[PDB]
Ligand binder design. Structure first.
Ligand code: 954
Length: 387
């Protein structure tokens, strides 16, 4: 329905992440926490770091409980290590509840804390299967549902500004909404379409067709989900498996061929600039991803614009962007620049993810993002990867 207390509770941007305010401990210690659907640990800075202006001080919390256990988390782009414990946790612009949750108190880290991101921790919203050190460490959302009457569902509206925000603007700007326990109808237009959650670990989905400006990429659909496809608010880009990326970039270059861009642009490294207000959106194609539907032999599609996959960056008065589609060796990742086009419902209770056109997606007067269906699609189970 309407969840006014939770609307506009996020801040941030696709490149540095979107975060929500939380409190930990007694008396409450306020921290800004990255919303990460990629993930399943609640982990906070708990020791001084050059990029943190605040951190969780366990010795100042009367409700802190030491689990006497360490946690070491090395991932591809970074790492952190910490100490496990529990404490009382709240979301000020959330449900009016306080829960006893696991907290990984980060004591050492490498390339984890982003300089100027304004967040001091991460809220992993995915399932216990991928929690560290193992699946016995109950994720935050599981604790929230178990201890309260909050429904087993959350929804995210990530709002890209469509232009760069400076340090002061990004702190003063509304970055979107995280609705805990419900769906807020003001955040989207049109209908919600649902795709099954294939398996509960990451938020895994199945893509069954890909089009660039209505032209079928025509790959075996298993390629689109090799080795998985996930919905991840903690990734900036739309990431595609190597072969799919190679085919998609060739098609995007062909559609936009009236302007030649350097190789560094297509690699997502180099910015491209245009005179203020002259970005030629119309030369870039729309991209549609068809997702398995809830009805047998039915699919639907989500369509994004270049206003989603060209990420605004500062250079001058020029309008500059980076290409926010990139290669992956770990499957498709529907990151923040995809999520910025849609209101996304993580319906854990019904094992499904819903998509609707976001009320805050960036567009022009000629084209809009879309969520449309149904389409008749056969043998969709064959699109999923096994082994
Ligand atoms: C690979 S297993 C694993 N991974 C993570 N993360 C992976 C990071 C990762 O590359 N992405 C893509 C992720 N969605 N989340 C992580 C982030 C770190 C910093 C972020 C920002 N901004 S997002 C945490 N955290 C934990 C606790 C893990 F078990």
């Amino acid at each position: 329905g309407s969840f006014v207390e939770m609307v506009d509770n996020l801040r941030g941007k696709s490149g540095q992440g979107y975060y929500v305010e939380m409190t930990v401990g007694s008396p409450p210690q306020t921290l800004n926490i990255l919303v990460d659907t990629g993930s399943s640990n609640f982990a906070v800075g708990a020791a001084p770091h050059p990029f943190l202006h605040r951190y969780y001080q366990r010795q100042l919390s009367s409700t802190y409980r030491d689990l006497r256990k360490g946690v070491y988390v090395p991932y591809t782009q970074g790492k952190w290590e910490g100490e496990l414990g529990t404490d009382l946790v709240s979301i000020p612009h959330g449900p009016n509840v306080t829960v006893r949750a696991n907290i990984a108190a980060i004591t050492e880290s490498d390339k984890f804390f982003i300089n100027g991101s304004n967040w001091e921790g991460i809220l992993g919203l995915a399932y216990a299967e991928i929690a560290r050190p193992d699946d016995s460490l109950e994720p935050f959302f599981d604790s929230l549902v178990k201890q309260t009457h909050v429904p087993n569902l959350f929804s995210l509206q990530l709002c890209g500004a469509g232009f760069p925000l400076n340090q002061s603007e990004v702190l003063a700007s509304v970055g979107g909404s995280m609705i805990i326990g419900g769906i807020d109808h003001s955040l989207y237009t049109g209908s919600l379409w649902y795709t099954p959650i294939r398996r509960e670990w990451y938020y895994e989905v199945i893509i069954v067709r890909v089009e660039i400006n209505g032209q079928d990429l025509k790959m075996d659909c298993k390629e689109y989900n090799y080795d998985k496809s996930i919905v991840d608010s903690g990734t900036t880009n739309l990431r595609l498996p190597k072969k799919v990326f190679e085919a998609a970039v060739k098609s995007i270059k062909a559609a936009s061929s009236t302007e030649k861009f350097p190789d560094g642009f297509w690699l997502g490294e180099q910015l491209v600039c245009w005179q203020a207000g002259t970005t030629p959106w119309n030369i870039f194609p729309v991209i549609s991803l068809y997702l398995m539907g809830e009805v047998t032999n039915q699919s639907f599609r989500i369509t994004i614009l270049p206003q989603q996959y060209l990420r605004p960056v500062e250079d001058s008065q020029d309008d500059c962007y980076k290409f926010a589609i990139s290669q992956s060796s770990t499957g498709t990742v529907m990151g923040a620049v995809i999520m910025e086009g849609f209101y996304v419902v993580f319906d854990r209770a019904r094992k499904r993810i819903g998509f609707a056109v976001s009320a805050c997606h960036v567009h022009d007067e000629f084209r809009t993002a879309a969520v449309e269906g149904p389409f008749v699609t056969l043998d969709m189970e064959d699109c999923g990867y096994n082994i």
